[PDB]
Point group: D2
Chain length 430, copies 4
């Protein structure tokens, strides 16, 4: 008496399949995992509950996990990030998915709850982006924890929460931090946002970037990519930071580094990337230039005080889905994107498929590691080995026609490293 899936429109499946066929050819890491492991089925017996943006890319990940032998049930980790044609293709393929663009917060939780129970038992693996599924199980279903072999976690906010859980003695399942694979953090967070931030802003507003002042809160991997994207189209970018190291990086790249208390008077476009609460507040909104565009690209919608806008504006005019224009008591207007939810996925299509192939190849490796070698992973938060990290990058070089050099025997002896790697020490920062 349980729903088999729930999507906006399963009739979108044929279109979704065409988009998936195109994405497969952009995702050689995932396709290589299928080539290597479809016969031996390393994930046989796995029952993976996934909570991760239900996009075309995630659809390719899902079909890879199934090809490797897993049973899978899926929900999205944001109410606006699902791509309904991708969700339809997965549903039509017979995979239980509960995801649509424009869920309410109640429907969102309900969707996660649909992923916990399989035909042959409760979930035994977690694949999470942001930690909502991990937190749901630990807080509300602790009786299921003993039956879960592992968690792999995708994003900075989610891994931050895992480390907090472990330090507070709350974590009861081994986890792999996928965010901090080199081939994830230094690629997805940086080059992904470099493309998908502007895509979200443009699809929402069609605003010209050239000539504008853009304020980017945070200069971590996401903020570095956002800043570079904006500068590239001719915006003057101002950075805010709490970390003196990241601040010094930004200054050395030619950006003005100042506080939001100052920058709010200058910005035409505001992008929050911090993963922290209370970044853009009423006192900032009241000082902004007319028709300032405000958005967030951090995981949770905690950075922008949207409640202040709802409570203090004279009127909110909906322009189109996920674009609202508020008229303030000072007579100026604020354009808010996706109600403060992650803008690249909420207003566009998130990262393009090629860079997601890096992140998702790491996810498949982590699921295989946790499922097939649980003795290597006690309760705690672990990284994938560098040799596997390198292997992810290597799997994407051929698509780009990169010709990698091989060390000679003499060179490898000189450097004291193996010809096949790893090539860097554990502390290397790339």
């Amino acid at each position: 008496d349980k729903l088999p899936y729930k999507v906006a429109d399963i009739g979108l499946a044929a279109w979704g399949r065409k988009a998936l066929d195109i994405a497969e050819n952009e995702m050689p890491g995932l396709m290589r995992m299928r080539e290597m492991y479809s016969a031996s089925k390393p994930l046989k017996g796995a029952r993976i509950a996934g909570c991760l943006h239900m996009t075309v890319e995630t659809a390719v990940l899902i079909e890879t996990l199934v090809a490797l032998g897993a049973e899978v049930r899926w929900s999205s980790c944001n109410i606006f990030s699902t791509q309904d044609h991708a969700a339809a293709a997965i549903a039509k393929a017979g995979i239980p998915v509960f995801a649509w663009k424009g869920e309410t917060d109640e429907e969102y939780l309900w969707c996660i709850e649909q992923t916990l129970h399989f035909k042959d038992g409760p979930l035994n693996m977690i694949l999470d982006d942001g930690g909502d599924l991990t937190n749901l199980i630990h807080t509300k279903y602790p009786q299921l924890l003993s039956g879960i072999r592992g968690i792999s976690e995708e994003t900075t906010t989610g891994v931050h929460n895992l480390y907090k859980m472990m330090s507070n003695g709350i974590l009861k399942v081994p986890a792999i931090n996928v965010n901090d694979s080199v081939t994830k953090s230094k690629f997805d967070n940086l080059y992904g946002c470099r493309e998908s931030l502007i895509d979200g802003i443009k699809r929402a507003t069609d605003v010209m970037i050239a000539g504008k002042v853009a304020v980017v809160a945070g200069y971590g991997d996401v903020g570095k990519g956002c800043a570079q994207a904006l500068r590239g189209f001719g915006a003057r970018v101002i950075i805010t930071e709490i970390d003196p190291i990241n601040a010094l990086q930004a200054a050395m790249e030619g950006y003005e580094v100042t506080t939001m208390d100052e920058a709010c008077k200058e910005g035409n476009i505001f992008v929050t990337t911090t993963g922290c609460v209370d970044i853009i507040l009423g006192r900032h909104f009241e000082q902004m230039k007319d028709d300032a565009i405000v958005c967030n690209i951090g995981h949770f919608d905690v950075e922008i005080d949207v409640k202040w806008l709802n409570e203090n504006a004279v009127e909110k005019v909906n322009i189109k889905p996920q674009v609202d224009r508020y008229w303030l008591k000072n007579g100026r207007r604020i354009i808010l994107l996706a109600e403060g939810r992650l803008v690249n996925l909420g207003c566009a299509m998130g990262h393009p498929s090629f860079v997601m192939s890096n992140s998702f190849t790491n996810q498949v490796m982590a699921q295989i590691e946790l499922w097939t070698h649980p003795d290597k992973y006690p309760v705690g938060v672990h990284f994938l080995p560098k040799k596997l990290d390198e292997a992810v990058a290597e799997a994407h070089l051929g698509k780009l026609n990169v010709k990698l050099t091989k060390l000679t025997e003499k060179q490898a002896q000189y450097l004291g490293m193996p010809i096949n790697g790893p090539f860097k020490p554990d502390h290397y920062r790339y």
Copy 2:
């Protein structure tokens, strides 16, 4: 006769919200309204417009009307109309004949609807690409004596005007708007720098980083497209016939080679030349699997789309304006907008701010031709530099630019008029 013909008048309220937002990004046009709405310099003008029917064009149209013109409009491309913008214009009572996805015969019918007003035939042309200009000269020459002027928006259109003039076949005075400084060095460059990538992304969602992109032509459009692609981490290869443009591209760090070589390397191909026969069957046969091919020049003459349709073994429509072909060699090609201009066909064209430069020039050109026709004999003319400077000045406040004024001592030193113009006529910026 029809009051208009659009896709869906029901889109008018959404279109109006988009127009409201665009007005606040178009200070040049709004300034023209502020200055001229009372005096109505375009009273008596009956302007037929043939120009991409977008949100930005809607703001231009309502500016012409505020200035006292009667206007009838069509789009200059079968895929460039934004149906919400067309609906807002139609709802406002302006005769517009335009929708996204016209057949070629519908396209001609739409232009033909703009020719006749209540009081008589058109007496002004506002053209982008020269189709309206050419239609009247070739099919309706009896209307020429009743037309006071033409203003022309784009490089391909002005190229045709100069050709017509040199052949002695141009019969109405024209202003070349494309070659205002504030048009060519802004719209063609910075506009394409944003809107090319928009078109490619909305169509395909492809990652640009890591790709090889081949841009044919390194004029104003090619310069903008190349910079955009490089900015997201594509390796950009340029083709050129002009040794000066070629050397510019080489000095900016781009490999410059022929399409005959570059077709073997590109993952993305963008044609910017305004020239026929740029990407041919012999190129398609050598391309990397799933190469994305598109055109941003005015006419769909650069890519041999006929070759793909005839020679591919499979052709699948992915979604509107995106086709994926399988060739006999087993590889795939993705073709955007059937080779029509990709930024307008697959996205929303240039953003409003830069279009305010171009369209402020257009309003000035219409005012010049309508109110000072004796200044403009039959031939092709530029706006004066003082007006060109005024267009730029009108956009500075929005960006909070603080312009320096010369002192009288400095202006005497330079031998320069203190309010401009500040550059000689040959200045290239």
Copy 3:
């Protein structure tokens, strides 16, 4: 009379090694030698040159001589001479009067030495900044009728030629070399993009990353300087009087404001305007400690160096062309080259490759004026676009650029001559 006057003839062997290396970077000039050494089109010419006596200029001088001219030379700046290059020229038998660190009176004496040859007075001028042109017009008007032509290298010099012509005081025909496309859009832009930073680094070794740099003017030179500084991670602020140039800088992501505001923020100041009174005492008094201040425009008129000398409480020479001043407010200012052009005064000026563009134009202008004087009435003229294109084409092979040729079908489509020129006269590149 002296055969020459240079700092140290002993530097000639080193100078010759530098000339050898530069020849291999200057294919345009070498091509002029290949084409014209046998026919000697400059036979009979007696060319007085006033132009920075650098390695690059030495290659130009030996090209003029290969083409049959007699030449006598001086530098157009007291700090720009490269003494090894001057020595190589002198050792080769060419009368050159130039050394690094001339007094202003020595500078004038050097120009005066270039006026008289064995067979008579000069009959051609090759000028950079207009000092030789102005000297003859004001102090030696009796020599004017014997001078066939002037070719002029730099923006400040051509500005003066146009001023002279409009006042009716120019008496010899002139070619504006600065505004060849292959000069203005390459030398002024890409040359300064490399040589500004060179001058600042050799003088001060300051880190650029993290600094605020203020560039006054956003013409060809300012565009190059700004890009250079931004490339190393300086935050660049632009000042401008021209709303078009100002809007270009804003659209490229630079803050545009006045010097009155920017003087409070800059760590590095670069003047590029060609205008008097850009950085004044009221600016110096507001500058951050150890602000570096320099000028790259032709004349030392942009920075009020007199103010520093009179108002500083301490002044210490760090090394040649680098002075550090302590002001009454307790802060320090570092001034480069006493406000003379910093790239040539503190480094080696533009690299040879881009100077081959400029100097190929110079040789073409000298040939045009000397051999076709009836084409050039008194007034200021440009080289034809075909020659401009030829300059660019001559540098493509060195960079391994592969230029596309139009097919006959494409040239017919475009209405274009198949070998060029490919652009109309108003094209801005």
Copy 4:
């Protein structure tokens, strides 16, 4: 009967002092160390032998160590990197320094040997860049090892050797890896080379960068900076790499990644950044374009086969010091800079003072840590704590007029971090 110092010309001291006064005002980290520690003299009793490029910046470091109470004797770690006016200023100040530009290899070793013995005993601290002093003591003076409290090591090559020494049981003294402080590797190696590579090439050759093809071997921190510098002036940059992760970074930044076997046919400028032997060989030289400029920026001159040029060229023409033009049997010419030694220091002035203040503030902190808290540092290779790394960056923000944001109590509680840091986990890569 030992020399008190040996420099090219002590008469250069007045000029050197002027350059030092200017550098001090660019080095707020070092000046802050003087302000904080000149009174308490934490390095009293220290006898530091330094082997590190004797530049204006190093002179400011030296005077800082002396101000903090140390006795110091110094040599350079490269035969061409000394700046004679800086060496003169140090000599005139009464500090034993043995360094000049253009040492022979025999003089180079002799100079290191002069630094071992002080009035009151042998050295008891090592400050090294490249490991030559560390290696000299371990190999030739093992009887001095017991009297040495610590080593701080500056550069990638030197730290690579320390880790090799420790893994082979050869290291007998605790060492701090300064290279891999965040405020060193991510700033010095990257932004320093971004400026000083082009400076070396230009002072040597005055060549135009725009329009050229430049080949950069290696895409680590140095190669990333070199590549960016060359691209910025309009060179087309081709990268070589053995590490698939770095190769993928380069491709994603828009660079062609291919082998030197292919790239040698295309390059007009070659820059080696690998720290590895056998990068540019005879077979590459014979295929290069006429007047190709070849240089190295890695620590040791092991990357370019200069011996091949000396043995196979028809003639070597010296252009000026550290610039040689070889005429090959194929009729083409090769311009070799600094005989293959590090080009930024050999042909120009190395990194500018501001970024060296980051590296050298870390060096002072490491010397204080090893000298005053030896119990925290057993034999092995250690990093400085993140709080000190952050403090280095923070000390440079004021000079740049950076306004750093402070977390509110509520934000710090939300993030679970202290308001004063550290702000990042140990694995953070910046």
